[PDB]
From a paper:
DEAH-box adenosine triphosphatases (ATPases) play a crucial role in the spliceosome-mediated excision of pre-mRNA introns. The catalytic activation, the catalysis itself as well as the final disassembly steps are driven by so-called DEAH-box helicases. They all belong to the helicase superfamily 2 (SF2) and share at least eight conserved sequence motifs (motifs I, Ia, Ib, II, III, IV, V and VI) spread over two RecA-like domains that together form the helicase core. Two RecA-like domains, referred to as RecA1 and RecA2, build up the helicase core. The RecA2 domain contains an anti-parallel β-hairpin present in all DExH-box helicases, which protrudes out of the RecA2 domain thereby contacting the C-terminal domains. These domains are divided in three distinct domains, namely the winged-helix (WH), the helix-bundle (HB) and the oligonucleotide-binding (OB) domain.
A structural analysis revealed that a serine in motif V is involved in polar interactions with one of the ligands in all structurally characterized catalytic states. In the adenosine nucleotide-free but RNA-bound state, the side chain of the serine contacts the U7 phosphate and thereby bridges the gap that is formed by the more distant conformation of the RecA-like domains. In order to verify the central role of this serine, we created alanine, glycine and proline mutants of this residue in Prp22 and characterized their ATPase activity. The lack of the hydroxyl group in Prp22-S837A mainly leads to an increase of kcat regardless of the presence of RNA and only to a minor decrease of Km when RNA is present. In both cases, the catalytic efficiency (kcat/Km) is improved by a factor of ∼1.7. We could furthermore structurally characterize Prp22-S837A in the adenosine nucleotide-free but RNA-bound state, as well as Prp43-S387A and Prp43-S387G in the ATP-bound state. The structures of these three mutants show that motif V is able to adopt the same nucleotide-specific conformations regardless of the side chain property. Summarizing our data show that the serine side chain is dispensable for the function of motif V and instead has a regulatory role. The polar interactions of the hydroxyl group with the RNA phosphate and active site components seem to negatively regulate the turnover rate of DEAH-box ATPases.
Numbering used by the authors: 546 to 1111, 1116 to 1177
Amino acid sequence: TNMSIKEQRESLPVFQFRDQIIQAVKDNQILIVVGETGSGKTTQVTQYLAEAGFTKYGMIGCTQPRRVAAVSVAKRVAEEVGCQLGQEVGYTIRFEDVTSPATKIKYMTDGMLQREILMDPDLKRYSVIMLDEAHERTIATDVLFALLKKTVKRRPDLKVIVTSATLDAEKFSEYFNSCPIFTIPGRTFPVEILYSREPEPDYLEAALTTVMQIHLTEPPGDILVFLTGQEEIDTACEILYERMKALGPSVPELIILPIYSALPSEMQSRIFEPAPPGSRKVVIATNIAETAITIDYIYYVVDPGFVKQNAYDPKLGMDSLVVTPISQAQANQRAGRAGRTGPGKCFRLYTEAAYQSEMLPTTIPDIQRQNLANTILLLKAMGINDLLRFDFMDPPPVNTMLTALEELYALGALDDEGLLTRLGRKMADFPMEPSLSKVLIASVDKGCSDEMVTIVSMLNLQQIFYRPKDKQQQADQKKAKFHDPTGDHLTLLNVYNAWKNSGYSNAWCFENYIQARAMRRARDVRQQIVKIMERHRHPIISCGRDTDKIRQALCAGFFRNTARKDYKTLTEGTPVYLHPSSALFGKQAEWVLYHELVLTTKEYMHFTTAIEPKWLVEAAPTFFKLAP
RNA sequence: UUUUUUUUUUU
């Protein structure tokens, strides 16, 4: 049984406020909890309420923005409770419902509560909902603010806790009917903040220069540096290696480790391995290392002050990944990573005035800079109509919502009055953007649903093809073996099929430079998608060698994303470019359909496939007029 | 024409 586990729970700062928070949650229906980093609110508050009997008539739900945090928090809470995982304490995430009729405390992804609230608007199974990591501002969390604010009026018994950063506390309060704010101190350590005197013309080189000084002019302690992209991070490690070699073998070893989402898990694990005696560790990271990945024994942070941010342009149907200055909170999250284990220093390569007057206090929330076609279909399915007037804490741009409503109209998900159609309600069952659900349903009439479920499973995935620095040409040679003459959609089909016919081999993934993590998730998606298809009584049909049927069906959902070769978009005529990764790169194709258009260094079409103009007027008869 | 930060979901 537990020996010293009780001491661990009572050692946490939140234990000093135990009695007071239990009182605050019986007093107030909605409550804001600000808990600084070390507080222990995540693991304890759920248990404090269960211990006070809040579990008697209702279950306790706690949302997390990330899957890994739902499982890790649930596992830790379960050991403190002393019960098997999935009994008294459980977690629910996509493809992993680890709960049983005995579960009184349930940790889940925000996304999961979003999806639950569609089938049960009053969330009858739950007595208490806690939204953890509310400061992250994930679209799901922002949606849950609005829905739960309406749910509280419907059910007076149900209690809601919402977490917040200190700066947004009063904002969140006024949103939630000016309910009270409970503050809980953390255990974090001081961090000395060093601003640059004159701004640095090259942030990459300045960051590398700062890393060398810290390694040679500072006491023992590992370094976390934040850069923006995998290619930039990969290049920085080689440059920093070359520079340390150039200095003698007299100088202490500096161990240079990249960290990014694209990186394989085996390579990711080494950043946690401790530094041999007399060595220093420098992790070169994206913003993945702000919240998502936690690295022990970090005492120095290099903050060049740049992140790659998403921004959606609805008039152009284009995402922008631009390197932009980070928010003040982001800089503070980056700084705080050196004070987690013990006291530390953070080297910001910008002026103090630049931080104070040239940096936004908070990062723009996601709901205000992503395509919302998905979110709006879900809210329509929940029976909400005047979405322009919907009660979002931070309302998204009006043009973005209007284009999302126009896209749902064009797919048949809304009628001329903007009410949800029978088709729309069906498309809302599919956990994907409407355009993909549209294509799955078009694929039944075309006789190609078997291929289309594979293709739609591969659209969801991130970093399908692995491109390591030293073996870039070897990777592209192996990728080209799968190229379909028509383009990227049937290449994804080829890749999934070759993996299946390899016996789902990790070795075959490694030898063909393909991320097994991606193929594994696609398979799990394909199984969930097939179950949804059976439920709506849509047969799974193979088109055999007749792959024109797949391309015809794709026209049903992606007609808006189309271009014609000088490429220019048919809808606006804006110039767009084939991505160098595309199976169509070297190749001629007059008419093209693309999954997504993203401005990095160029306006690049993603997953482009060659199509025939007749299919566009076949698939979308009202959205193409003919003319000589 | 030469390469995308981070994350979420069936009934």
